[PDB]
Amino acid sequence: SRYTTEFHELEKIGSGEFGSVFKCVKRLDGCIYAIKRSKKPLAGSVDEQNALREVYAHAVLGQHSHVVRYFSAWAEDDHMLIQNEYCNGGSLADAISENYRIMSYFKEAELKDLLLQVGRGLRYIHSMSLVHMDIKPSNIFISRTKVMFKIGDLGHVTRISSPQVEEGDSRFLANEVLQENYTHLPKADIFALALTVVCAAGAEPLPRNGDQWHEIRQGRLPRIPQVLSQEFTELLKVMIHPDPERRPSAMALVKHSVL
Template sequence: MREFDLCSKHLRLTPAPLIDEMTSLSLVNINPFTPESYRKLYLQSKGKRKAQGDLEETGAEGGKLEEVLPAKKSVLREINMASRYEKEFLEVEKIGVGEFGTVYKCIKRLDGCVYAIKRSTFSGLSNENLALHEVYAHAVLGHHPHVVRYYSSWTEDDHVIIQNEYCNGGSLQVSISENAKSGNNFQEPKLKDILLQISLGLKYIHNAGMVHLDVKPSNIFICHKMQSDSTGGPEEVENEADWFLSASVIYKIGDLGHVTSISKPKVEEEDSSDIFAWGLTIAVASGAESLPANGDEWHNIRKGNFPDIPQKLSEDFYNLLKNMIHPNPEERPSATALARSQVLRPFLGKTEELQQQLNMEKFKIATLERELREVQQARVGGLCSDLDLEAPFPNMSPHFQQLHRHNY
């Protein structure tokens, strides 16, 4: 059995011969989403790298730093250990099969909690790098309530294994299929809820400089919260009117195997490509038939024509969905705009208005409290007898001038 913990850091932070440092560096995977962080950590740690000749420019053989890094296969197969998967987890059942591997529902033996364990088989350096891609993206993104949570990753027996959050409601695709069998569809209030929650997740991904590139029903996951959890989430989402998080169902975007940087040349439409796919995902959830992959129907959609759906949506909501698939990427709303849309969050504008009123009242109260302290200090100091009772303080508010006359 072979295992390598991808979260381990093998960089040596103490002075050592150049050959030892390069050997240590060879055991570190370079995360494509944070290329500078590793290089700066290596070059700047304790300020002692320049003495060895600026390794950013030359390595042991005079080449670029990146050129001395070995193929990642040697990193993945570096350590021989017993199977961590079998040792730490009890496999319950297979819950999904995707492009990059198989997902299992597992119980961690130590904490007794349920996790989704994704096992991706790799053969050859190209497939190996693809398998690692999701690990890199998860590691950089961290935790957000509308992105499937990442816990750990490692490799063994030619598999990249990812320990993710288990979503007990399955995928949106499963729910859509069940609705189709029963002749039902998600209605507008639920569609708005789903659209808003995943838009918050996409906003988080886009703000990190990434684009998902694989937004579809099978990559949207559902978590049914326990009753005791239903009031515990509002503080987790960027202080934005989080009233909807009191609901018992949370939607999350997952499967980051295709995530790439927005700045990559191949991402022609940048983050708006995710918005286009997200709009079509909502169309399918609202009852549209399976979308074509090509042909005249697909080109018709690419022109901005929203797919036919078997229900009547409000004009504002329908127009919002149409804008999401606008043929001009610049005309599509951003994930940030969707997250603040009053079509999806009708109470947001009222909340901001009430907050402004509250701030004004707090200012008035603070002013009155300050004036009250001035009056009290004057009385305690015995100064009041020497003051003009008609105008004790020129800058005092009329309310306190009247109060002062009454007291004296």
């Protein structure tokens, strides 16, 4: 077993239907990695393409400061394994939970930094003719040393020129994707990112469906309890515009003075 021989498990850091994720030391270099171990996907199943595309996405994207770095992927004993960098801050979902626990919140300066950093990650992914298609807090990872946000969980990644859309989290999904219009997919990542930042800013849990879900897709920004500058508010708002073409690209996004 490569997993057993090459790596020492330190802590279970994730669990789900796929399998489990462990914080591990690689014995050879002594460094810490996040290693996901998943069962074999069933024949002709969505979980199949998902796990397959994760590795391809990592392969194309390779090393970038705002994308979770891939180190290797292999299979043995009827499981798939992928070895990625370990982000010691967990995900943005974990960070938001910690804020809830201590009743703290991300200030505007921190929200701008989150938006700019993940924005730079998207700009890179989009420049390689790919889209992420599952941006949300739980897929944004955090490295502290101060803080670096890195786009992770690349299982929904697809090409803009031959789009294969697996329906993502309904809470973050732009209306035109639901309508099976895949002609503006990078703008779907932009929509999702805005709502990710809105979650980080202290908004109530986003709706999965219903009237509140539609209000957002009509371009109405969810309520944010803390005071934010008008220019920052207006940027988040145009990022969720009903017309994808009115949403800024990632390139246009990161070139906002406000950030």
